[PDB]
Design a protein around this ligand. Sequence first.
Ligand code: HEM
Ligand code: SF4
Ligand code: SF4
Ligand code: SF4
Ligand code: F3S
Ligand SMILES: [Mo+6]
Lengths: 509, 220, 1244
Amino acid sequence: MKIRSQVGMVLNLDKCIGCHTCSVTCKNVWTSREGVEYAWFNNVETKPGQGFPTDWENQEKYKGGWIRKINGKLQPRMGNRAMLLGKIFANPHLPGIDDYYEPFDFDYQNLHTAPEGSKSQPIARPRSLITGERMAKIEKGPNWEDDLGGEFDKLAKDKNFDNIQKAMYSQFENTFMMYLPRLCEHCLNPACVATCPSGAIYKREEDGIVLIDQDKCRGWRMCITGCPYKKIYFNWKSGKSEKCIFCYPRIEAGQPTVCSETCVGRIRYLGVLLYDADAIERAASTENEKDLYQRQLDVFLDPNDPKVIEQAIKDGIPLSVIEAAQQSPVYKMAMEWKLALPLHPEYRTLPMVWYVPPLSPIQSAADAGELGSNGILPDVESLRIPVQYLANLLTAGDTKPVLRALKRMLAMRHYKRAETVDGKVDTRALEEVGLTEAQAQEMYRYLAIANYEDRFVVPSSHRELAREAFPEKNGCGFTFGDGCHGSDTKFNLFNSRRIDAIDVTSKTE
Amino acid sequence: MQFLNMFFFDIYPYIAGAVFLIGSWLRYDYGQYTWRAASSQMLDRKGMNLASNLFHIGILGIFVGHFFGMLTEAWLPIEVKQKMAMFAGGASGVLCLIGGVLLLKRRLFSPRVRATTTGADILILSLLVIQCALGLLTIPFSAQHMDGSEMMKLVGWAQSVVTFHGGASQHLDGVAFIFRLHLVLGMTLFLLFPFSRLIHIWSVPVEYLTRKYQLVRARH
Amino acid sequence: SKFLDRFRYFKQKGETFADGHGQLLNTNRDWEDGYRQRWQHDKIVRSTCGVNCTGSCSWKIYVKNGLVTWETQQTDYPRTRPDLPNHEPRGCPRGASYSWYLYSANRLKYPMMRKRLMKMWREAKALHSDPVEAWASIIEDADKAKSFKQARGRGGFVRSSWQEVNELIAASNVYTIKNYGPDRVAGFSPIPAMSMVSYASGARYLSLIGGTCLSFYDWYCDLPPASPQTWGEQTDVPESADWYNSSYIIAWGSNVPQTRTPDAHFFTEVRYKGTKTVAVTPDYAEIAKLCDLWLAPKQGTDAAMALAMGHVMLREFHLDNPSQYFTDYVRRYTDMPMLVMLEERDGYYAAGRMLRAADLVDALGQENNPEWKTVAFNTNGEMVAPNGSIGFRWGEKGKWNLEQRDGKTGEETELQLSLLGSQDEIAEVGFPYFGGDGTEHFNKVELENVLLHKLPVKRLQLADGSTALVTTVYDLTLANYGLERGLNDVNCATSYDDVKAYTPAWAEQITGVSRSQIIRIAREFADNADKTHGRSMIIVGAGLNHWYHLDMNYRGLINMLIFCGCVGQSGGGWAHYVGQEKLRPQTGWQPLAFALDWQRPARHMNSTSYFYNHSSQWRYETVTAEELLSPMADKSRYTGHLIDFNVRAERMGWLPSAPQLGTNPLTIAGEAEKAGMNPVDYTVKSLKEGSIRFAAEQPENGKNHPRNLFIWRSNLLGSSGKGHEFMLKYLLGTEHGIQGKDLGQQGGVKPEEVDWQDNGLEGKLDLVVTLDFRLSSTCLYSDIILPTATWYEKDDMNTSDMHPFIHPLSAAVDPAWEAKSDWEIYKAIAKKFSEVCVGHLGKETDIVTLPIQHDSAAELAQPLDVKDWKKGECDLIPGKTAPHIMVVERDYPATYERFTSIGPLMEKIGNGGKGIAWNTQSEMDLLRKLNYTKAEGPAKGQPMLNTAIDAAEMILTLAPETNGQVAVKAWAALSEFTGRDHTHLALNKEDEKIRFRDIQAQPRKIISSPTWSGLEDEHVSYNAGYTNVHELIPWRTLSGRQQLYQDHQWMRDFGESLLVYRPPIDTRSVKEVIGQKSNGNQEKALNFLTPHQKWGIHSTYSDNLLMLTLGRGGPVVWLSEADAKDLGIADNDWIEVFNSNGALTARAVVSQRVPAGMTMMYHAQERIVNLPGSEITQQRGGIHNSVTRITPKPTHMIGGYAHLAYGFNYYGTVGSNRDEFVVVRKMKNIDWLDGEGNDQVQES
Ligand code: HEM
Ligand code: SF4
Ligand code: SF4
Ligand code: SF4
Ligand code: F3S
Ligand SMILES: [Mo+6]
């Protein structure tokens, strides 16, 4: 039993409007440099589709995530330590630049410098950001399939259509689409960390954020294959890998991530989750992949249990973190209401970014149909998005938790309508799904009203603990180049000292 | 000629050896962000599988042969080591050269690789291909002295160089010229090592084979 | 030492965890500073996007390293009630990518000029020391004028300087005003709400010099003529937060998540409150993803579904089981009980005009405007003139309200709705029906062009001894819908399955939507409305409003909402969202933008008629008026080209003109002086005699076309401008891609009001000046490009229809390179103009025509019919049967001084708008202290207007929405008309004064104002029409109520007195070009729809790399799989779309969500990026507007008639475009025409 904390994220797909604002803000701040211009830490994909990189969910092709051996032990699908090492001179599964898209720019200056007497209006043609050469045509992009852009038979190759008779969905009347915004999961059992030969990737203890140490990374580029979500991008210029950093510079002071605060649909929730690090391997190696979801929930700890609180303190969790964990929207959606589900729990990484499945218009039927258990509002069985699809995406194929989430959402709706339109108290739908009137009211407070202070309950990472904030406050930022940052030993070849440190020791003790 | 012989085989070896070591240390302490393998695989996967493997498995064979070859009686008289070096090392060398040549054809003519490469990457790779070609070329010259007479000379030199014993150059009295070129170009590579992509070699991830899978860094 | 640290290998290993699966390390993490220092910044500045999207989102502009690096939404908007979600963070993807423009490769850094033009300018200045005369030497030379006009859009821009361009512009403006007239100079800038002062800058300069200010709301087809028709209001809608108060919403032709992104959460969140949502779109649009039901009617057939839905509602909630709420609602708030006169036909009657107090002997005791007061029957069978009709608005006070009272005895009455049960006899009335016409692409249902229905009537004794039959609008309405009321009406329905004049079965055939669906939603919608007393809402957008018959689509939706009493109730009503037309502090901004502080009036113009005329799109018209008439109208009373109707509209004072007269309006006074007549009389005499004519009559004579055009905050040539190819040919005089022949070439019939000439006048514009921060398509075709400041480099304000906050645009850093804010650009031009004009223009007298204005007493022009003075049907009475003829003094040398100061008219005359006026002296005194005053010169003592901030403060201090003091005086002014106190609506905020610097700190909610019909309150959300329904303030319509019946002559004869289904029109633009220039690949005709894109706001951002990267890398067109496969087109293949109007090139997006028959090129992707040469024109491929053409509609030209009177952006012809059809085909040769030898060839 070792309690650790992390700020998790829950995205309500039901409210996602597929706008991409989240993707742009991240890009502007973190990946506008040459080398990662093609990298989208946060990217939104329209489903059905194959995503970015193309078909990243196909683990038989890409080899991402963990596999549970016959003896019960965990191993990266990539291969064990020696197998992985044997592939280092040339990663055989590595995605190529074309699997993402060839980053491009346009010759705008031609619109400006076109010489007088041209025989046709000047125009700006595309140029490769990798070669600098003229591109005859743009044939791909990071969001190429946006809004069902492409033939159904092409989009339907979607790994999530497995085990589903998909013919019926190529019919205009049965058309359906949803949005899947995604970033790094900052998993509890990250495959990237396990697949990096130099050990440059790590999970920060105080807040669970997983980073690639830009000093230590050696560019072995094996981690990219290891991540089953393909959220690690190789910086072709620097020769090192980079990935979503969960905006730690902001999280550290209690601020939401950029993609969270900038989410126009108000669908992202940030809240603390306390977990037993000692139960990670045990949960990730459960026999049936359909149990990984529940096994992870079991690894989460109840922030209001004085047994948990007392242990948290003993294990070093700051008081303000424990308090935040007690008002965590993420805990309420994942543990209480059971509305949030993990993304592809079968990869066995124990993802920390969960999702609330979306509702959808009712399927096409012979007639305008009739009232169901929820009146004019839809019954979970009439939803047009095939539940088996959502289950392949969030619950290893098990439709039970997906239906429970969707049904409860509809339940809240039925209840709220009785109240606001009829003026009566009708708990029939709630009782049907096991929700109390209070839980439904609290679900409504968080999902519908969703005040800013309710969506984001981020505690400080407490950068003052176990460190020396005073000298840091005084000297951080003066980047003259003292050459002493980055190491604990004071000796240095350039015979210099840290600008943000005190080298004149007190002699008064 | 005696002047050049002393410069190149008595002095130069220590200049390149000092630059190699201090240059590596200094770039490690002040250039971590620049310390990478500089993979280009993603920009063009074509042929990289065969090429890189050939080149690396090959050059690593040579390196093992050269190591235990010149830096290390009854069960291993010099003549037997020569034969091993000629067949085992010659085979590795052919694999290395082919890979090296393919990697170079790629770096120079693969538009994406060429556009994003640095001068050093072309230089260093070129010098290795040439060094590997020279290497294989010494084979027919060692084939004239199957008794290990030449090898005994080269090994005498190498050993007196690494134990800081003066006069190392003497050990080379009359060796085939070809060997002289190989020794000089090979040492040069050590001189250019700390300023090239070759620093990745220092980072061969051996600790991985015995490391726990999940890493967590405490507050620091 | 990082090297030595390694040796601490062992010492850095802490505890393992998870039974050896994990290792805790105590190693250095300093490297993490790398990302921390990227996030760190210098400061944050508040600003917003000055683009037309309705977003009005406040952003945090980050400055780092002294440069703008990125932005994130502000979240400090004043929070809404606790039972409503808040607005933060708002924003969208386009807004998030704006930072890109500041230093990007397409940034305009210096003023630019076409080389050829620069070379002639400098050589002319070497021979002419005076710039006016240097310009003349160029412009008067046919060969010189041509060498630079045909250089337009063909490269050759060279770096110039502000000094040079400012002089050339001023010279050209002076010369043009002096020789042809001020109204030969014009400016085009849209939506002032997105950047008030930025729009005001050019508009102010133009207004002072007499130039024409072109409209935008109608031009862009955002104007829903149906609104001015039903409510006499340009547009007023509930705020987005109000959606949360609705329990039943239908998103009809509105892609909420894509076109109203920052407000979408209100839609997705209200669903959790129990609200049911329904999406109505032909394609599986993004909006469908968020609803409970998806209905997909055939595009353009929506009115049909509306009528059918209205049918059920009336049948079930008005007739069979009368809803008490709905009944009282239509009784007190619609013109249903009003009396309509029947006209004798042959065997049947036709609905005529509405009965007026004046028609009855007693005139019902109405001595004031009796010919403008409607009449109804009270429940005791007596006749009555109820309060509220447009007759009580002017010439009297106290009765212009909706208190159910007798306009004579002042006593309460109870209007009766239907004469059924009180009729003197059943008369048969003929109702027009068009549901059987149309093209092959839409289903039709044959019946009769005229449907006779049995209507209960009463014969009455008129005041002239004649006798006539009347009936209620109500009865006429139930008949038009096909409701059987017991008269055994053959043309009425016996069941919803009866294929007839408006049934669910009938609609199923036309729309393809199951009748049972139409019936289920119709019931639910009405049931909900009845239960909640009007909390049913319909969100509608350009999906419906951009069709030729948008009025039918709209009245269909409007009638549904009225029948359910949803308009005027929080959570209910008509939610029209298009362009950002709601500039809230209206009366504070108008005097600034048009210089009403110095001179009155200005020269406003409705842009659709303006471009239809000057870009000569009329010379190619295919649609005739006769084919739009009611089958019951005298077709001979309506002969002529559609433009002929416009010209007549102009001379009758219904619509504005530009240019106005065929003679320089600055020379009219000097001629009235030699004639011994005052200016006004001399012009009327000349008009009659024909010595002076309306310019519209001879647009190609050489003196009636515009010559100087300013374009800013707009991308007219490219994006916006319908009929792109026609503009290039007639306005610019450059190569064009028009494919079809004009009337003269097809031997068509010449108009009867406008001169005709076989060779149209080309290159009318002498100088095109564009202000922008990026080199847009319009800049590319201009003569002079002026580098303007981005939204992150200037101060200004922004408001929107979506929320009640007013926030600013702020300069995060001074404009980069040589850029200047729009305000500073026009001030400098005004300054150079004042110098350059010395000796050419002094204190001149200008004769200005002003059409009859809505919300002015003159709106009561022609009460019973239409009389054209030129046809001698009446005398020429300016302000009644013709436009007003105004006298305006202009002090050209003092333009700059006037521009930079608030004129005396605000003190001498006051301020006002929307029919009311008030004293604003106190505000001017306040302004003298905030802006300081002129120390000397012409404006000595007046407040200053030096900076954009001074201008902004002017707007805030003057507007009632931002100054509680003015708000009370404004509500007081209105109270005089209604006789009801309304000051109570702002007394509690009388001390409120919104300041520019305060909104930079935090956005501020505005104050309830009589300029709008909704309230800014803490307990009830803003809901359009709320005041009318709850304060009993009448809608500015003939009847004062919501007008279901349009009784204007033209409306009746064009078959639109009542709504009726009208199939999409045939633009006949495809059959004359298809196959004419084969390339080997198949061609096919498809409906060309242009909804607004996801990767830009119109064309803005289209060139933005982030948007281009998240989209498809450039211009693309969506096609259904079936249509693409039929044409041999694979996803992303180069295709060409074309018709008679021109051609465009782009790549294909093949998708299943697009229904066969339609194609979609999301609006505006313009002409500057990734476009290859066209195989149809051998020129650069065109844009989406290369295939469209302007086609006006007469019903939109009506003026001088109550709610149907003019107003800038209030009414006028609209640029509809969804009816268009095009030919699509896969391209063969892909030639870039750039000499790069990098062309391609597509197979098969
Ligand atoms: C400074 C470093 C180096 C030294 C001192 C060195 C020395 C030698 C010597 C003495 C021989 C002939 C062995 C005999 O006497 O039988 C040889 C052969 C050879 N070397 Fe090197 N060498 C060096 C670096 C390299 C490198 C970097 C490469 C790869 C490009 C290389 C590739 C070869 C090959 C292919 C052969 C011939 C076959 C064999 O003996 O394995 N050498 N080298
Ligand atoms: S989602 Fe993030 S933490 Fe999880 S395996 Fe991938 S990169 Fe690592
Ligand atoms: S910003 Fe929010 S609503 Fe928009 S795409 Fe991203 S996650 Fe979805
Ligand atoms: S473009 Fe409009 S909707 Fe988008 S962020 Fe800017 S103001 Fe908001
Ligand atoms: S494998 Fe490790 S060395 Fe860098 S490229 Fe990936 S983090
Ligand atoms: Mo618009």
